[PDB]
């Protein structure tokens, strides 16, 4: 039972860590979006980064 209680507490800390992974309101790892697109040239063509949910 002690090992099971430690396991569950570490599992909740994972949710805390993943939910706080934001930079000025945007995240590539908290699951809130499927991709982010950054500017690649002056015409506005994108540099996509696929989201990796954690």
């Amino acid at each position: 039972n002690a090992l099971k209680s430690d396991f569950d507490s570490l599992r909740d800390q994972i949710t805390k860590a993943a939910s706080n992974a934001k930079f000025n309101g945007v995240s590539i790892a908290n699951g809130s979006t499927a991709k982010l697109t950054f500017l690649a040239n002056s015409d506005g063509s994108g540099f996509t980064v696929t989201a990796k949910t954690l």
């Binding site: 945007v26 697109t37 950054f38 500017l39």
Partner: protein, 55 residues
Amino acid sequence: SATANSMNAVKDSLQRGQSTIDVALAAGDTITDLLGKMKEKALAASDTSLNTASF
């Protein structure tokens, strides 16, 4: 002689036209600078990683 004297008015008119175009080119420098800045604004705003306040 009267024909030669009337060329002074023609010269006055051509100089007036050059002055009008000079004022338009001075305004056009301002307008092209403003348009370049607006293009930079729209280019920055098209990024989706901005939060609402920056947009």
